[PDB]
């Protein structure tokens, strides 16, 4: 019974996130969006954050440890358990984390400050999220389809 | 619309972009919306110039809230491309934030410029 209640709570969290912030829900999804809203406190409190802040929300202990001891800061925070940074591998993971955090900052500012005529469909209420997700998936597949370095193909002699 | 401290007079717009170019050569300038937000939140920012040609205008509307909380003057120029190549960027810059220091002719220009922005408000 606890599992059934937790499943319907996850469905409710998804529906309420698509109600509140359709752009960010179209970008990363309802659970990671709810984690970001939770850490920042509110939607208009998340919207006042730069993209570099939204990149490393949640990784703050490692961040301030590294900043105070002149180590190297963490590359991402809560954003790591989104969908779109999990397809990459290698340094393209950190590059996609940067780009995704910037698009999340734009989408949260749009979902927290833009007005709508109240007869506005959800497909046009999540327009910035749709456009940013399509562009960001194109940039991800370019970063993954970057070819490897050419080499000299040697014969059996060494010639 | 939502850009109510608009700089519409072209003499004032030319003065704002000339001071932006001088601060850019002094490396006293923070370019971009995220870097502008960081400078305004940290409180190092003396004046902040947003652009009104932003196609979703709501992606720079959070900076008026932080400037109302931190009491720094913000103003809207017409063209983001003009702001961009005023900073010397070769991109479209939608928000810029120019900072202050101990003693400069540039700091005197900053004080006079925020007096003119307070005349707009």
């Amino acid at each position: 019974e606890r599992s059934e209640y937790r499943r319907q709570l996850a469905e409710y969290l998804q529906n309420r996130m698509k109600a509140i912030s359709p752009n960010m829900t179209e970008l990363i999804g309802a659970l990671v969006g709810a984690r970001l809203i939770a850490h920042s406190g509110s939607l208009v409190n998340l919207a006042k954050n730069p993209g570099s802040t939204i990149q490393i929300l949640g990784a703050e202990k490692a961040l301030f440890r590294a900043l105070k001891t002149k180590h190297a800061t963490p590359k991402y925070g809560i954003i790591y358990h989104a969908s779109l940074v999990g397809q990459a591998s290698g340094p393209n993971k950190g590059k996609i984390a940067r780009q995704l955090a910037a698009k999340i900052a734009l989408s949260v500012r749009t979902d927290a400050f833009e007005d709508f005529p109240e007869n506005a469909d959800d497909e046009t209420r999540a327009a910035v999220g749709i456009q940013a997700r399509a562009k960001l998936e194109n940039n991800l597949r370019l970063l993954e389809g970057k070819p490897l370095n050419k080499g000299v193909a040697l014969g059996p002699n060494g010639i | 619309s939502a850009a109510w401290p608009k700089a519409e007079d072209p003499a004032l717009v030319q003065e704002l972009l000339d001071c932006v170019q001088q601060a850019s050569h002094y490396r006293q300038l923070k370019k971009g919306a995220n870097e502008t937000t960081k400078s305004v939140n940290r409180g190092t920012s003396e004046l902040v110039i947003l652009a009104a040609d932003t196609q979703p205008l709501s992606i720079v509307l959070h900076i008026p809230l932080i400037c109302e909380e931190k009491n720094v003057p913000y103003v809207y120029v017409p063209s983001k491309v003009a702001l961009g190549r005023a900073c010397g960027v070769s991109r479209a810059v939608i928000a810029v934030s120019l900072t202050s220091n101990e003693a400069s002719d540039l700091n005197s220009k900053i004080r006079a410029l925020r007096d003119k922005v307070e005349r707009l408000a």
Partner: peptide, 30 residues
């Protein structure tokens, strides 16, 4: 630069709190 920025944020918060406390401790009125 990152270390100096964090130390400057901490020191600016300390200055704001100390200046508030100093004002609270200690042709004006017509």
């Amino acid at each position: 630069l990152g270390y100096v920025r964090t130390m400057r944020n901490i020191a600016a918060k300390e200055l704001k709190e100390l200046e508030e406390r100093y004002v609270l401790a200690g042709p004006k009125k017509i």
